Amino acid sequence: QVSDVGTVIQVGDGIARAHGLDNVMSGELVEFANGVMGMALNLEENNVGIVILGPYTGIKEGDEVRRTGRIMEVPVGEALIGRVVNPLGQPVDGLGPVETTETRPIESPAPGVMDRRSVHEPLQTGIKAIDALVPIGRGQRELIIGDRQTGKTSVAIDTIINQKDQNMISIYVAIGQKESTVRTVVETLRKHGALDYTIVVTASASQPAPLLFLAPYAGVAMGEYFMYKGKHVLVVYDDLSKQAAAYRELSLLLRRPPGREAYPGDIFYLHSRLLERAAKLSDAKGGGSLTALPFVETQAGDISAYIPTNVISITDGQIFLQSDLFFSGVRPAINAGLSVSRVGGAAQIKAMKK
Amino acid sequence: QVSDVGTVIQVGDGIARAHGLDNVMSGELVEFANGVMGMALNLEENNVGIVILGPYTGIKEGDEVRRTGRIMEVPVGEALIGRVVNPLGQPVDGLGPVETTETRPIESPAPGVMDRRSVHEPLQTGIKAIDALVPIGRGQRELIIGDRQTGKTSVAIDTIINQKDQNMISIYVAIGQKESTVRTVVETLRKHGALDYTIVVTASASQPAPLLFLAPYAGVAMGEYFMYKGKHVLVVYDDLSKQAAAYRELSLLLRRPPGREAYPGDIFYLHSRLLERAAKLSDAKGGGSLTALPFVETQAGDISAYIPTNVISITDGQIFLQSDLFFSGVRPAINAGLSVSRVGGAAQIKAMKKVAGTLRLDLAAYRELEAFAQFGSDLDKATQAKLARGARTVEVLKQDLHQPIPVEKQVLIIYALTRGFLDDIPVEDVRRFEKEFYLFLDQNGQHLLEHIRTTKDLPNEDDLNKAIEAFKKTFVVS
Amino acid sequence: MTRGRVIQVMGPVVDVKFENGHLPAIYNALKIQHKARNENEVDIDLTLEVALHLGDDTVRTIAMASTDGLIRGMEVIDTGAPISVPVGEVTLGRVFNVLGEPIDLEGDIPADARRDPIHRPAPKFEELATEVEILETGIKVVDLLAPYIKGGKIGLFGGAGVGKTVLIQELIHNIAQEHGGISVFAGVGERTREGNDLYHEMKDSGVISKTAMVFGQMNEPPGARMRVALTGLTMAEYFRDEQGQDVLLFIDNIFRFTQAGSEVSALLGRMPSAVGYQPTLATEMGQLQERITSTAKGSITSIQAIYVPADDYTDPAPATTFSHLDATTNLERKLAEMGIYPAVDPLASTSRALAPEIVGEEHYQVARKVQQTLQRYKELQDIIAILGMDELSDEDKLVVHRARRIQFFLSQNFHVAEQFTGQPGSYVPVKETVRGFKEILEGKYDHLPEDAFRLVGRIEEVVEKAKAMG
Amino acid sequence: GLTMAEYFRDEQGQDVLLFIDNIFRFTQAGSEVSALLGRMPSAVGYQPTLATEMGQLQERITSTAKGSITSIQAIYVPADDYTDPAPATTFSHLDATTNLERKLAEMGIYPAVDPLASTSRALAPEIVGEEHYQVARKVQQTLQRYKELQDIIAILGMDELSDEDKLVVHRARRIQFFLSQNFHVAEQFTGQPGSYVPVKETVRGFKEILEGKYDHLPEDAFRLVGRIEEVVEKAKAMGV
Amino acid sequence: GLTMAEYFRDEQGQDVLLFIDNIFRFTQAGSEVSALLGRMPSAVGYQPTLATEMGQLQERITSTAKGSITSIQAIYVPADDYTDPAPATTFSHLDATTNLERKLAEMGIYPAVDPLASTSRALAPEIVGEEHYQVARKVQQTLQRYKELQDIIAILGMDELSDEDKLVVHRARRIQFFLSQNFHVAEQFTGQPGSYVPVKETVRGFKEILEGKYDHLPEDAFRLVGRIEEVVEKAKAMGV
Amino acid sequence: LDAKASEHAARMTAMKNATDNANELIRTLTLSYNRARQAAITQEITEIVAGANAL
Numbered sequence A: 001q002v003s004d005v006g007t008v009i010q011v012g013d014g015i016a017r018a019h020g021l022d023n024v025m026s027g028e029l030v031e032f033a034n035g036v037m038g039m040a041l042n043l044e045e046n047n048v049g050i051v052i053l054g055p056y057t058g059i060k061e062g063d064e065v066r067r068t069g070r071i072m073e074v075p076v077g078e079a080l081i082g083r084v085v086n087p088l089g090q091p092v093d094g095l096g097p098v099e100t101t102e103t104r105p106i107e108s109p110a111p112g113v114m115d116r117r118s119v120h121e122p123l124q125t126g127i128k129a130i131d132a133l134v135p136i137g138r139g140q141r142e143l144i145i146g147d148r149q150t151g152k153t154s155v156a157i158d159t160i161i162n163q164k165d166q167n168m169i170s171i172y173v174a175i176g177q178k179e180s181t182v183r184t185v186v187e188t189l190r191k192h193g194a195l196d197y198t199i200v201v202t203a204s205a206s207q208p209a210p211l212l213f214l215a216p217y218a219g220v221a222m223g224e225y226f227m228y229k230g231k232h233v234l235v236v237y238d239d240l241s242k243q244a245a246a247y248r249e250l251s252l253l254l255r256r257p258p259g260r261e262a263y264p265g266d267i268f269y270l271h272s273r274l275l276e277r278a279a280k281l282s283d284a285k286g287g288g289s290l291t292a293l294p295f296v297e298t299q300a301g302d303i304s305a306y307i308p309t310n311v312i313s314i315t316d317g318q319i320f321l322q323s324d325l326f327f328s329g330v331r332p333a334i335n336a337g338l339s340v341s342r343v344g345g346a347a348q349i350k351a352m353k354k
Numbered sequence B: 001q002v003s004d005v006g007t008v009i010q011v012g013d014g015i016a017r018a019h020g021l022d023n024v025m026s027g028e029l030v031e032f033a034n035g036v037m038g039m040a041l042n043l044e045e046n047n048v049g050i051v052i053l054g055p056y057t058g059i060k061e062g063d064e065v066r067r068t069g070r071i072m073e074v075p076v077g078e079a080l081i082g083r084v085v086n087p088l089g090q091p092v093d094g095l096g097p098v099e100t101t102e103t104r105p106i107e108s109p110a111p112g113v114m115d116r117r118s119v120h121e122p123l124q125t126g127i128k129a130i131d132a133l134v135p136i137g138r139g140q141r142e143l144i145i146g147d148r149q150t151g152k153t154s155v156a157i158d159t160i161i162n163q164k165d166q167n168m169i170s171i172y173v174a175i176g177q178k179e180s181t182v183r184t185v186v187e188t189l190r191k192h193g194a195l196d197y198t199i200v201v202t203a204s205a206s207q208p209a210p211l212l213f214l215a216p217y218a219g220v221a222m223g224e225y226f227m228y229k230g231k232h233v234l235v236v237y238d239d240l241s242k243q244a245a246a247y248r249e250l251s252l253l254l255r256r257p258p259g260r261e262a263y264p265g266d267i268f269y270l271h272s273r274l275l276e277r278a279a280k281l282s283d284a285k286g287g288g289s290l291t292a293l294p295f296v297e298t299q300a301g302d303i304s305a306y307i308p309t310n311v312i313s314i315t316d317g318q319i320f321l322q323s324d325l326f327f328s329g330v331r332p333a334i335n336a337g338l339s340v341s342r343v344g345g346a347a348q349i350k351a352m353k354k355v356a357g358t359l360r361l362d363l364a365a366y367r368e369l370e371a372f373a374q375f376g377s378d379l380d381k382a383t384q385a386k387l388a389r390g391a392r393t394v395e396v397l398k399q400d401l402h403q404p405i406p407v408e409k410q411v412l413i414i415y416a417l418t419r420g421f422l423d424d425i426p427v428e429d430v431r432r433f434e435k436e437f438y439l440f441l442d443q444n445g446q447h448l449l450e451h452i453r454t455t456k457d458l459p460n461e462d463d464l465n466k467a468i469e470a471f472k473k474t475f476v477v478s
Numbered sequence C: 001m002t003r004g005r006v007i008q009v010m011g012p013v014v015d016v017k018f019e020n021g022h023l024p025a026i027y028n029a030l031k032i033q034h035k036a037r038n039e040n041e042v043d044i045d046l047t048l049e050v051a052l053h054l055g056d057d058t059v060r061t062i063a064m065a066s067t068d069g070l071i072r073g074m075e076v077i078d079t080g081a082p083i084s085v086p087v088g089e090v091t092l093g094r095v096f097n098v099l100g101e102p103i104d105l106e107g108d109i110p111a112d113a114r115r116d117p118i119h120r121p122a123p124k125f126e127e128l129a130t131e132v133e134i135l136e137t138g139i140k141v142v143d144l145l146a147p148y149i150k151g152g153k154i155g156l157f158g159g160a161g162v163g164k165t166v167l168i169q170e171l172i173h174n175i176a177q178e179h180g181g182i183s184v185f186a187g188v189g190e191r192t193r194e195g196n197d198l199y200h201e202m203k204d205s206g207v208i209s210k211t212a213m214v215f216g217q218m219n220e221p222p223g224a225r226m227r228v229a230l231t232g233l234t235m236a237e238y239f240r241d242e243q244g245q246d247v248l249l250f251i252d253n254i255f256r257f258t259q260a261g262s263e264v265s266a267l268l269g270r271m272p273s274a275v276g277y278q279p280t281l282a283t284e285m286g287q288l289q290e291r292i293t294s295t296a297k298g299s300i301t302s303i304q305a306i307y308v309p310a311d312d313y314t315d316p317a318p319a320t321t322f323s324h325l326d327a328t329t330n331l332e333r334k335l336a337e338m339g340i341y342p343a344v345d346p347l348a349s350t351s352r353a354l355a356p357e358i359v360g361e362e363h364y365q366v367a368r369k370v371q372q373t374l375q376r377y378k379e380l381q382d383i384i385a386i387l388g389m390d391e392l393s394d395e396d397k398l399v400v401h402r403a404r405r406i407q408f409f410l411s412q413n414f415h416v417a418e419q420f421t422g423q424p425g426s427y428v429p430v431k432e433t434v435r436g437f438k439e440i441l442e443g444k445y446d447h448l449p450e451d452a453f454r455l456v457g458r459i460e461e462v463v464e465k466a467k468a469m470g
Numbered sequence D, E: 001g002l003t004m005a006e007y008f009r010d011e012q013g014q015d016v017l018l019f020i021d022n023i024f025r026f027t028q029a030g031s032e033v034s035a036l037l038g039r040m041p042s043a044v045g046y047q048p049t050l051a052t053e054m055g056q057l058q059e060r061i062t063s064t065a066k067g068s069i070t071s072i073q074a075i076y077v078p079a080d081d082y083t084d085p086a087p088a089t090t091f092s093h094l095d096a097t098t099n100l101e102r103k104l105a106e107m108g109i110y111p112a113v114d115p116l117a118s119t120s121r122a123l124a125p126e127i128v129g130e131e132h133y134q135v136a137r138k139v140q141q142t143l144q145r146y147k148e149l150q151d152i153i154a155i156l157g158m159d160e161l162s163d164e165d166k167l168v169v170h171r172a173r174r175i176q177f178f179l180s181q182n183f184h185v186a187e188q189f190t191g192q193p194g195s196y197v198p199v200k201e202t203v204r205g206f207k208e209i210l211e212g213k214y215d216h217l218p219e220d221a222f223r224l225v226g227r228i229e230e231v232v233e234k235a236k237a238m239g240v
Numbered sequence F: 001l002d003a004k005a006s007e008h009a010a011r012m013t014a015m016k017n018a019t020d021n022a023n024e025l026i027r028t029l030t031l032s033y034n035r036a037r038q039a040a041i042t043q044e045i046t047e048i049v050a051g052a053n054a055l
Ligand SMILES: Nc1ncnc2c1ncn2[C@@H]1O[C@H](COP(=O)(O)OP(=O)(O)OP(=O)(O)O)[C@@H](O)[C@H]1O
Pocket: A147, A148, A149, A150, A151, A152, A153, A154, A155, A331, A332, C352, C355
């Protein structure tokens, strides 16, 4: 019987190949013998290609793999607020289990052309430079771009803190950061009281590449749960460049032919699929909104690089933070020449604009 | 049928694949039916990849190949002195057999951490710039790097010739060169008398790739025999880049996965294995030493290429030669600013150390002020003394072909330069001043020269000043 | 069943076939011990690390030493665990290789000693410290202008003759003396001559008894050069976790760790990444760096020397390495020649810890004032060289007067330099450093000669030295 | 062709001249068939056995005790990149080398030989003579100095140079033009018959130019002439 | 979309406007698919069939005797690399191209059209008129001369330029600024309403600028105005 | 005398500005050179591997 049970054939570098699993669906979750989860990626004629969502040391040739019957999913709900979880939804803060009762698919279609509405509500970040020169609206996708040690995390944390007295759920997604920095960020949020409305999703630099791949999608699914219920959500992706690097690693391990800067062909699709889910819904759909603030780290301020240009061609504007301006004492180092909000102004309040 | 025999399946491009040979070892020698040797490098599931150490045109599919039961090894002994030989130990000079009674394996472990000693003895090259600014000690690994036609071979030949009256055995390894070029080098060594202590190992461009791959290992294996006996050996590898290219060819023909610039993954491991066998041994096992001078040829001065970066990482110091310096008239063409030696003053005598610091400071100050040379024509300021001193220093550091200088004479001329005795000689006369000064020294300063040779320290300052002034009042400015 | 047999040998890569259902796990250590059965064989003592499961009950491994003399079909033993090295008090004062075997000639460790696996997951989220803490080193320039963080990573930049070894020895000595923490030195890609010299220097200085040394030499295979850093880290983690200490870890050059990773990836045949590096560059760097952290009961702080290929800071290896750094220390040959023996560049060195939230308002202000004064003095150099001191205005002369004294007061007499100079060393608390620099900036000592500031500890020693001179 | 020449070298002891039209095509053909033969590609798309194949051919072209072969080979440089593996490997097989630059060819100087990159083992004081050696080295030094001045000239103009640098430029331009020559086989391109110049004559002419005997002559009179007296005749025709 | 447009072109003889939002995404998606189909990758990882697919799409977009289709297509340039295969292969399918430059966009010049790289088949004296052709060619000549000086101005400014080059820069900066325009659509980014400029007015204004009529006006008065009279009006509004 | 002083001051200022501009140009050119170098190495290694696994 090889309909719901398989046997591992090859293991290496976080990918595996299994025999059997006749009835497995494409994109399904599978569970290894030791409890580690995986995702069915390729359904070939005689074998299944599985991406391992965890530590692959304990997985060996000849081990048993079984079906879960569910497309790749994460738990969602209000019980997830105030907790720190991994991209699979497992808590990592040590405060016990999570009492969610429903799930959402990690890959979901974006709202259609007729399901959307123009952005018309301000999102107050509390930072004078942003709220004056580059306003952000609810439902907008605004890129924050700059070199390392320039204050992107500080901008995101201030924005999240400012949402205390505003109807706004915040989700902070950390991809490839240091666990110590994530711990300190969570401590500052706890001190300022933002954990009453914030969810933290973490996948540190020691984690395997598939988790860094999946973290933004888990975050956006958790946000979509609230957005389709009529609420307003803010989502922050702390590095999309780290996610791009992780996906490049996975693609090269699958021996797919690389292109510019060794990135795969669908590196643009990877980010466009994710960022298209942020939108301002129409009255018929309920009026909910989801706002995304992706981060991109440049090298020596080169805005013309592959990943920066890809992300710029997706979002609705960008805020450029300048390193030498940062060193000169202007810590919110906005470069007003390069920063722009395409769908701003319409969301800015009347008193502020005039 | 037996595990000691095999049959050839494929022949081509200098490698063969054989079925059978179940008990063959990795790196073992094998013998083909027509008598050509081979080396087993790839042990696969059902076949063995063999690189051929000779003409492969006589080998066909189905030919028998046999075990030898031995690892690669070369003859070693004092009978190799004065001979020119190939990496297998077979003479190529046509002077008869070699008459050697001992062998040593090609691959050998390097001396351990606790078997070594700090480098403390100078290797006198006879080149003023090297002996003063980038010293080389016994047991050191020093890289000579530059573009083509910059003087790399000339530096090595002068260094080998300078070892005549020193207890040093020289080994010159030629990799991928013309046989005519090797013949010319051997002729120059014979003319200058260096064949009384020199061994030449050659693997020319027409030889099979494994011979070029194995030549430096043969050279270092021959050197280790003298090193472990308590003697001091100098080894020169003339093209590590060509050796690396030969290894790349073999690896690609054996279908091993390629890396950057199509080199295999262990190309760094190859050169580190080679260059870590040069060492200065501790007193517990004789004070023997082996010093290495690998060569690397750069393309358009790009020292960031893969092989140059590997060798620069491995070695203890670098000497850079530049073509613009070569054509400017800087005759040894050594860039003293870029070149570095991490042994430093530990490889110098006291007399040289007491003047080298001043020489380096003057040269650096000149290089920093070189842009002001045009504006000194109207005497804008008093820093022009530094410019004059730097010009005279550059004139002093020049040297001719195949004329190494004794260390005492180098010390005396550098002392004269740094103490200001050349400040009134025009820069056009410094070379002739140095030549006449050496002649005057040979005539009258024998006590000073003997004092330096015996005590390794400077003579009395007053005596040096008196001798220099006595020569100076007889020198005639052109 | 743990017996396998060699089926393929291709350089440092070995394929081993095991019985069905008894495959070893990834990163397990395999042992080959063979005695020459006849005259056509050689003795073998080799260790292999499992890398992949190829299917058909075969495993691809990377060798920890040379594979010469291997024969297809010889027996391979599975140890059932990754590489394991001794830990504890027994490792202090010893020199090891990647396998945990002593390289010195002092004798081997008894087989009953505790051994820990080299590969382990990083500490969990709830085991980490929630607040940032300064590590006091006792060195004035480091404590003022580039503070260290407990559990942080510090990049070390410099050449050969700038005193890197002396700085390392002084850090080891000061940490052992004042905080009670040991140090571990990890020589990734170490040259044998320099390793011998470093061992003798440490033995002469006396810091050898407080440190454990691991050398991965250049002539060793890429697998060994890749795993040396991890074995050193495992040695330090025991003292972090069991003894609750604050431990220093030194890595000889982490670029060589990345290069060894690239070589191993090329040998295993994976597709190259951007500039020829391995696809798993960031993952490997993270798996190394994330274990150097501060926990609820101790910390490991790391000083790492970094080589920048072609001076390109945009190169992927330096770019990935800098993503984990918290501070930067630069050594300047110009200062070394001027006689500032700590030789730390005061303007180039940077630290994220220099912020008033964690270091203090007074400390922050004093540091910024010092940096501003030294920058102005740096600017005035050309006009001083051209027109001389007398042509400057009065406030420029005052700036020069303060700046030279500050520059000299940034020097310090080290404990490990006593064997050469005859002068005892000093340990200066950060509070004393801040107070002394504040007093110098306020002009409390404008009348003292500049030589009185040369090589001293606290500010009172400047007054004592000036009084002794006259 | 090589075996045809080797017969005369060995069996008759004759002196042989061997001209090869373009030796790069041998390597190029090998690289064309390498992939179909089934060999993995090397660095720049060449075959792995590039150096060995080149050596097995080049080492046969040599003089021996029985006879001498003097050979002139034309070597193509792909995309003007002298670091290309084929010319880079070929360099080690030669005793004398001539480097042609389209930088000089574009300026109207023919035969467009690079005066610095070209090397020969015969340029030694004991082979060509002390005077010849000194003149050649001084010419190379002057041209090398002129090369460095161009970068600052293009920015700051000629007026800011010192009097020594101005004289260096003045003489270097004339030397570079005098290195040109009119060939017999290039009448279809130049419109005038070619010239033959003895080595003594060219040494004396360059020595006079270095000494400054012809500083007053216009620099265009030095183009494509031959002997030094032809420069004077050309300038006289131009009306100087 | 092309199938929907072809019906109106053929069955009804209509004139059709076809706007394509980004034609580069078509080839990008083709390259994403091609890897999984089993094809060997081309130069920059693109599909080997890049040219044929683009040709088969573009050759259908054409005017015939039955009706005419005029199409305006936006083409994305990855990483601002104009030598990329996808932008490079689409050039041969176009009758007119306008190339936008980030350098111009950053200097505040919109629509940021590169005036030298943009080309059209319609720029010929028998199509647009003799004076139109002369004015366009002279504008392009001045802009080329200005471009040739950029390194000198970058290093040491305008102080060491000759008098002719100073006038060239003076005219060229004003021409470059006058090529900018305020769009109707851009009224949402800034309160300034847009303008529609007839080609006769454009030709007359550029001819007047070339003739030196407005050399005394400040160069900031030429930004984003439209007709030439607005330059005078805004110069008067500011200080003049 | 006043004119001579003015001329020397003007030369000093102009050369200072020229030096600063040249330094900035050197910085940007070095950045572009390093980008080109990395892109090259990527291209050759990708072509090598594509040819190798095409067999
Ligand atoms: N407005 C501000 N005022 C003062 N200090 C600030 C401000 N914004 C940021 N900083 C400080 O500057 C530093 C910037 O670090 P931050 O994490 O915010 O930047 P980043 O770009 O996200 O960094 P990285 O990529 O290294 O994580 C921190 O030490 C932070 O405390």
